[PDB]
């Protein structure tokens, strides 16, 4: 029973690109196909957001808001001044004008997109105090995203999200490995990193930072520049927010809204040793993560940061423990799924035996029925009721 008709909006993580990009190879489906199309085909209106993969959740949230209702992206004057990037970014037609007219949406987010979705909701409802103050004080204008009072989001579903960050960021060679992961994902799309394609192919959307791939520059080369850029060296980055300390900081202000349903899906593609207590990558995990990231994730302990044995189980990219919802520096409630989806709390939907990329189809896994997974999910979302009544 379909209790609602709101559309679904897909939101990628630290890798991701629009439907026209990457020669049509979809982030949402990868080698499996087109998740969006599947859903639409089954009666579930579905759209796709594309925002800065490497940008800070804040940056992304602003981009998302503009992309959704239309308009010129406004990163906030206080923010922009604080971090040293442009206040105004690209312009968007707007995907869903129904939003300004009282319609709502369901957001389905992968990886870091989960952090972004949460933030979007928080800003939409509550705005930003810092933002508002600075405006009043300096006589500058404010985006409605900073004011609050919106009623746009019915639910948020996160999949393989580092709510509490990912120890991946602690690798000695994280900078280089992280970009190799981007190269990996290009590779998946049948796209080379040593070729100076004239077409855009994969736009990092770094307009605020004044960065873009140049004529004659390969992705390898471009990445070499990015590594030394503010989108990697500043705190206003995905790098920072993805870290354990960064995620905590974000958790301190990004709270679950009582007017919104939250569903959390975890992922794991590992086994435990006996002699070590470490977690190891399972056969089938994506090649990149199996060699380069999983070993580390499955063995990295840090008493100070709070990284114990609980954090070892991983999906090749994110520690499973981080995925059920924000906990580090968080007041949000998390409840194990009991058949009943509850509002204003993290409905912990459990852990699935799929890797970070398999779950979106970017890496194959013939044993994972992806279509069924998204379809079951869509039905869940579409079943969500406006309100409830106590009963025995
Ligand atoms: Ca696989
Ligand atoms: Zn910023």
Neighbours of 287 (CB within 10 A): 13
Binding residues for Ca(2+) are 284, 358, 363-364
Q: In whole angstroms, what is the distance from residue 168 CA to residue 176 CA?
A: 12
Q: How many residues does the chain have?
A: 392
Q: Is 315 a catalytic residue?
A: yes
**Would you give the DSSP letter of residue 22?**
G
Residues pairing with 286 in the sheet: none
Instruction: Report the interhelical angle of 219-227 vs 174-188 (nearest 10°).
Output: 150
C-alpha distances in Å from residue 300, one per residue of 176, 181, 304, 313: 18, 19, 12, 11
388 is catalytic: no
- Considering the candidates 56, 111, 143, 322, report the single residue annotated as catalytic: 111
Give the closest residue to 261 by CA, choosing from 96, 382, 100, 95: 382
CA–CA separation, 63 vs 53, rounded Å? Answer: 11
Helix (H, G, I), strand (E, B) or coil at 208: helix
Judge contact between 1 and 39, C-beta under 8 A: no
Catalytically annotated residue among 12, 110, 163, 356:
356
As a whole number of angstroms, the distance between CA 261 and CA 177 comes to: 35
CATH superfamily of 8-383: Alpha/Beta hydrolase fold, catalytic domain (3.40.50.1820)
Check if 356 is active-site. Answer: yes
Which residue's structure tokens are 């990457």? Answer: 22
At residue 355's C-alpha, the angle toward residues 351 and 358, to 5°, is: 115
Residue recorded with tokens 């979007």: 120
Token pair belonging to 374: 């998204």
Task: Quickly list H helices, the chain.
Answer: 35-41, 57-69, 77-83, 113-126, 129-138, 144-147, 174-188, 219-227, 230-233, 238-242, 244-251, 287-292, 294-297, 370-382
* Annotated domain spans of the chain: 8-383
Look-up: residue for tokens 């049509």?
A: 24
Q: Binding-site residues, please?
A: 59, 79, 85, 236, 284, 358, 363-364
* Beta-bridge partner residues of 237: 55
- Residues 105, 6: contact at Cβ < 8 Å? yes
Q: How far is CA 30 from the centre of its chain?
A: 16
């Amino acid at each position: 029973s379909r209790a609602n008709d709101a559309p679904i909006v897909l939101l990628h993580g630290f890798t991701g690109w629009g439907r026209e990009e990457m020669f049509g190879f979809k982030y949402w489906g990868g080698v499996r196909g087109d998740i969006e199309q599947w859903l639409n085909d089954n009666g579930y209106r579905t759209y796709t957001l594309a925002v800065g993969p490497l940008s800070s959740n804040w940056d992304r949230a602003c981009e998302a808001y503009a992309q959704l209702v239309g308009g010129t992206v406004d990163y906030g004057a206080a923010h922009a001044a604080k971090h040293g990037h442009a206040r105004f970014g690209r312009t968007y037609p707007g995907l869903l004008p129904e939003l300004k007219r009282g319609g709502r949406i369901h957001i389905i987010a992968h990886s870091q997109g989960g952090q972004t979705a949460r933030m979007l909701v928080s800003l939409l409802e509550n705005g930003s105090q810092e933002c508002r103050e600075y405006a009043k004080a300096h006589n500058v204008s404010l985006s409605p995203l900073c004011e609050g009072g919106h009623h746009f989001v019915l639910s948020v579903t996160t999949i393989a999200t580092p709510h509490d960050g990912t120890t991946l960021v602690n690798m000695v060679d994280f900078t280089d490995r992280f970009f190799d992961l981007q190269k990996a994902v290009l590779k998946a799309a049948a796209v080379a990193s040593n070729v100076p394609y004239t077409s855009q192919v994969y736009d990092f959307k770094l307009d605020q930072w004044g960065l873009r791939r140049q004529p004659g520059e390969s992705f390898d080369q471009y990445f070499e520049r990015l590594k030394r850029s503010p989108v990697w060296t500043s705190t206003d980055t995905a790098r920072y927010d993805l870290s354990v300390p960064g995620a905590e900081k974000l958790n301190q202000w990004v709270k679950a809204s009582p007017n919104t349903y939250y569903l959390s899906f975890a992922t794991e593609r590992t086994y435990r040793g006996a002699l070590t207590g470490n977690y190891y990558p399972e056969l089938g995990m994506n090649a990149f993560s199996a060699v380069v990231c999983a070993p580390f994730l499955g063995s990295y302990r840090n008493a100070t940061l709070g990284i114990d044995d609980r954090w070892l189980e991983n999906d090749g990219i994110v520690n499973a423990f981080s995925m059920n919802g924000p906990k580090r520096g968080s007041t949000d409630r998390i409840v194990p799924y009991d058949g009943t989806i509850k509002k204003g709390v993290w409905n912990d939907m459990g852990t699935y035996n799929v890797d970070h990329l398999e779950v979106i189809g970017v890496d194959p896994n013939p044993l994972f029925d992806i279509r069924a997974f998204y379809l079951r999910l869509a039905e869940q979302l579409a079943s969500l009721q406006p309100h409830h009544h106590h009963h025995h």
